[PDB]
Design a protein around this ligand. Structure first.
Ligand SMILES: Nc1ncnc2c1ncn2[C@@H]1O[C@H](COP(=O)(O)OP(=O)(O)OP(=O)(O)O)[C@@H](O)[C@H]1O
Ligand SMILES: Nc1ncnc2c1ncn2[C@@H]1O[C@H](COP(=O)(O)OP(=O)(O)OP(=O)(O)O)[C@@H](O)[C@H]1O
Lengths: 263, 256, 95, 263, 256
């Protein structure tokens, strides 16, 4: 319906790189808005542009009308209480305890009594299913359990804009099948708005509500996953199935071979 | 003339590379104190200070013993070894405690500081902390800076004290002079406000250049962990050119 | 001040961790004279739900005696999605 | 038919880790013999046990009858000319050129004239499709092109036992769809024997000839992918689909919650 | 009494930790020479030697100037500064060229060697090389060892020469003594086979302990790149305890 984020016509380019030359996105409420791309793009940089951690150069990032380079310093800190993100590999502080990881955004944000601050962590740690902790460290946590704490810090207070940088890292099909059901339920229960940047097509279309696709500076298609494959150029169609026919090079050069010699 | 352009473009980058690092330093110290920073700071001084204490104590001896060996071998043919208590003290107070304790501090805590911040940029804890808005300059860097300014003059004093006691050990217990004479000449030549306090003013302005160059190369490194290890050996070169270069001037001054 | 009398506790307004701790204090002081537990919990006049608004209720249960101290009704179904998400539907009671 | 490798009853355990307590495998010729497992197992260590780079402790690794801890030092170097492996992330030497990467196992093995040693590299670089190189370094190679060169290094001279440590790293569905067809063709053309250790089920059963599965010390099932799902225990069946029902914990504890308090 | 057990099991590990490293050293030097190793070796000496040349040349001056400043300030009230050419030379020849050029070499090439091998274990090039059977001790380690034994005595000589020339610069060109009494007071007192050749025997057995402890902690480190950076600061501690400790045990032998 109403848009959370209007991305409109940025050219945040890195010197040589042209990346995101002219693009425009719509992120509306309550809906899984997936994004697929080739590796070596600015996809996980794009989330920082939404987050305003990185700074745009020509466009506008409209968090409900207001641009996130125009607000003052005391509004910026208030604006980040609606949005919390996921760091690809999971970003845990390996010096504070796992009880101190998840309580940290509360104490960084607000003052409450200890019998409440210790109370919210024991609930959000149960909502991921890892509750018998709060005593051990981020060390001796298996990599499968690692992102789940980072998920709980992503739902610290109770934001309404969580961005996922590849939830399916290449883990077990167990933990892949775990986080499939974790994602929808929280979006159902807490009425959030998620974006998943992944390359994992049979999971991605089966769970998303809308898929934009960025290749290098352009939307090659959008909609629900039904009218992606209908209106597919044979550059984005081959991106879906991975065929060796299209404008991607499987052969590095084009030559008769029998022209130069071997030194 | 192209390798000329490569050399030219490299040292042009190193100048700008400094002008960023000065701006990061003025952004740290000109800030309001964070809430409960003292509990962060004392834990930090437990990491940088107390860990390095052993490697400078037992290195305090071996500088002292060789000073107590060549200081004896020189002074015996001239016979006037009423200067043994003075030629152990005045070198150890004026130069080798500012100099050699810096090159050992740039070794351990000078280079373990740029790794710990070099690891924090790569796993993007520092990026994740910014989205929560805790601005990691005041959270991670600033207790890791003030535990380096305070903890180095607390080390050269421990270096110079165990150095002088070490010179007395192989001097009068294994070779033999008049302990009395020793102490006598020692306290009858070494002023306090001219020598020791000038031996600490040199050890503060070494602690600033050895940590601010160290904490910068961890922050403004790159990811891809060949990007950590190229930076942990970028401080230890850049410290030791600026320890000894800044020593000379200072010494000459406070010693016309 | 938005937690009233009549042997029942009614929660109105919004719980947003600046006006959530004196809600926990003022709810606690009413509890200290509401012994022998005939009391019912009302929460019908909430307009927003989160785990924060849930968290103060269990602390009220934690201060009281035995497991079935408070009894719950007028749960506005934004809670009810959360309660099974932290899996509590028998751990606290209802109708 | 005849087995390349008889793995038989090893207990190569790491101090406290009783990994591979008692297991036994059969790798026969000409056939894709896939292996799936949970992350944090000894799967990529298991390949070193086949490779004899790591050393077993109680079992036997039979390369065509002969154990690979019994042969002499001049037979060991001759035995490794039948087998070449791929290291998960691709193992390129970032100082030698890409012409020097692929020619390196030839010069490390045999002396030939330069007009032949420079000739075999220009063919094996075309068989992966990256032939216009041999001039640039392993640097400025995109990560998608990185494993290819590795592929060549593998099928360097001409071995008949190549082990794959996760060919589908989590790359694009392009490069995933590229290496799907690269794997079969080389096995068809050069009559090899491949093993793929992956977690990528809809690609894995659709391309393998046999799937053993190791969880912690035991085969939980084997056969072709048709009689994996027939004779599936509800520990390996849930490993295939990733359901939250089975002997895997989604909840970390079972405590009746309502017990302790919050400090 | 449990932290007692933690300390007890730690130094039990450090002893075993040595007994592995000696076995790796005897496995390198007692081997036949690899084919075409010289072309590998000369490129390696490019990496370790020639790169470190700048940081020891300009550090050769600042040790020389402070020796040419305190060496003047001491010797003026005693008046007999016919020893300025001798008290610049005999310290720089006997101790500070073996000692200080080691702590600067453990800094740059002592610690950049344990990173380059620390990176090669993690990406498993060293594991992949073994399956081709090229046994990476003779391929990667052994040219990275022999470019450290040869290249350090080629550095202390360059350190001691630019040090003495540096003492002559601020001595007679900015303060002023007899330019005749400098070298004629020098050349007579400083034997060659007793002082310079003993100033190199110390700089060989420093080059062995500073490289073999360095190339070991890269090889027997772990992956997980907090496992590189804990090892690149495990050499620079372990070198400087063994540079200075082995110095004092040596100078009592040749200058008893
Ligand atoms: N600070 C920076 N800002 C912008 N670009 C950068 C920066 N540092 C490096 N780059 C370059 O830009 C690219 C960043 O893209 P990045 O890998 O972050 O996104 P991505 O490919 O979507 O990541 P992911 O692996 O999460 O999909 C890299 O190729 C890098 O070469
Ligand atoms: N040299 C070693 N030998 C045996 N085990 C080791 C060694 N070093 C570490 N380990 C431990 O054993 C495990 C090694 O398993 P490893 O991760 O290599 O296999 P894997 O989980 O199959 O890898 P992959 O990510 O390729 O699937 C690690 O958990 C580690 O804790």
């Amino acid at each position: 319906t109403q848009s959370l984020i209007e991305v409109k016509n940025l050219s945040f380019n890195r010197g040589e790189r042209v990346i995101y030359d002219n693009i425009s996105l719509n992120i509306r409420r309550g809906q899984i808005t997936a994004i697929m791309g080739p590796s070596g793009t600015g996809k996980t940089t794009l989330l920082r542009l939404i987050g305003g951690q990185l700074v745009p150069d020509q466009g506008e990032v409209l968090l409900d009308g207001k641009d996130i380079a125009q607000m003052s310093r005391q509004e910026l800190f208030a604006a980040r209480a609606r949005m919390g993100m996921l760091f690809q590999s999971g970003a845990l502080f390996t010096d504070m305890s796992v009880y101190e990881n998840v309580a940290f955004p509360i104490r960084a944000h607000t003052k409450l009594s200890e019998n409440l601050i210790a109370e919210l962590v024991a609930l959000k740690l149960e909502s991921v299913g890892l509750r018998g902790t709060e005593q051990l460290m981020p060390t001796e946590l298996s990599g499968g359990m690692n992102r789940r704490v980072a998920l709980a810090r992503a739902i610290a207070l109770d934001p309404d804009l969580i961005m996922y940088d590849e939830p399916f890292a290449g883990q077990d099909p167990i933990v892949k099948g775990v986080l499939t059901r974790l994602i929808r339920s929280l979006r159902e229960a807490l009425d959030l708005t998620t974006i998943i940047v992944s390359h994992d097509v049979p999971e991605t279309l089966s769970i998303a509500d809308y898929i934009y696709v960025v290749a290098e500076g352009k939307i090659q298609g959008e909609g629900t996953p039904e009218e992606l494959q209908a209106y597919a150029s044979p550059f984005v169609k081959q991106f879906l199935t991975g065929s060796a026919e299209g404008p991607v090079e499987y052969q590095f050069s084009h030559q008769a071979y029998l022209d130069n010699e071997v030194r | 003339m192209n390798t000329i352009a490569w050399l030219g473009r490299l040292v042009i980058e190193r100048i700008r590379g400094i002008g960023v690092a000065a701006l990061m330093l003025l952004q740290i110290i000109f800030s309001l104190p964070s809430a409960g920073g003292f509990g962060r700071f004392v834990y930090q001084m437990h990491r940088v200070g107390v860990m390095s204490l052993l490697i400078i104590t037992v290195s305090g001896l071996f500088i002292g013993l060789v000073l107590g060996l060549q200081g004896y071998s020189i002074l015996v043919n001239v016979g006037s070894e009423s200067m043994l208590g003075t030629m152990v003290s005045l070198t150890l107070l004026r130069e080798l405690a500012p100099v050699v304790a810096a090159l050992l501090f740039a070794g351990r805590a000078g280079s373990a500081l740029t790794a710990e911040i070099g690891s924090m940029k790569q796993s993007e804890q520092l990026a994740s902390m910014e989205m929560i808005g805790v601005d990691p300059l005041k959270q991670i860097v600033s207790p890791r800076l003030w535990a380096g300014i305070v903890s180095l003059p607390m080390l050269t004093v421990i270096f110079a004290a165990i150095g002088i006691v070490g010179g007395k050990l192989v001097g009068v217990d294994f070779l033999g002079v008049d302990e009395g004479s020793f102490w006598s000449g020692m306290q009858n030549n070494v002023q306090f406000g001219h020598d020791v306090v000038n031996g600490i003013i040199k050890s503060i302005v070494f602690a600033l250049l050895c940590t601010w160059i160290a904490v910068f190369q961890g922050y403004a490194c790159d990811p891809t962990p060949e990007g950590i290890a190229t930076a942990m050996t970028r401080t230890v070169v850049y410290s030791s050119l600026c320890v000894l270069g800044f020593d000379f001037v200072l010494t000459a001054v406070m010693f016309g | 001040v938005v937690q009233y009398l009549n042997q029942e506790l009614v929660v109105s307004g919004k719980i947003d961790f600046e006006n959530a701790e004196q809600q926990y204090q003022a709810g606690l002081a009413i509890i200290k004279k509401q012994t022998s537990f005939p009391l019912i919990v009302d929460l019908k006049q909430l307009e927003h739900g989160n785990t924060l608004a849930l968290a103060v209720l269990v602390q009220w249960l934690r201060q009281t005696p035995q497991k079935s101290g408070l009894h719950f009704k007028n749960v506005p179904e934004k809670m009810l999605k959360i309660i099974q998400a932290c899996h509590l539907q028998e751990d606290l009671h209802l109708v």
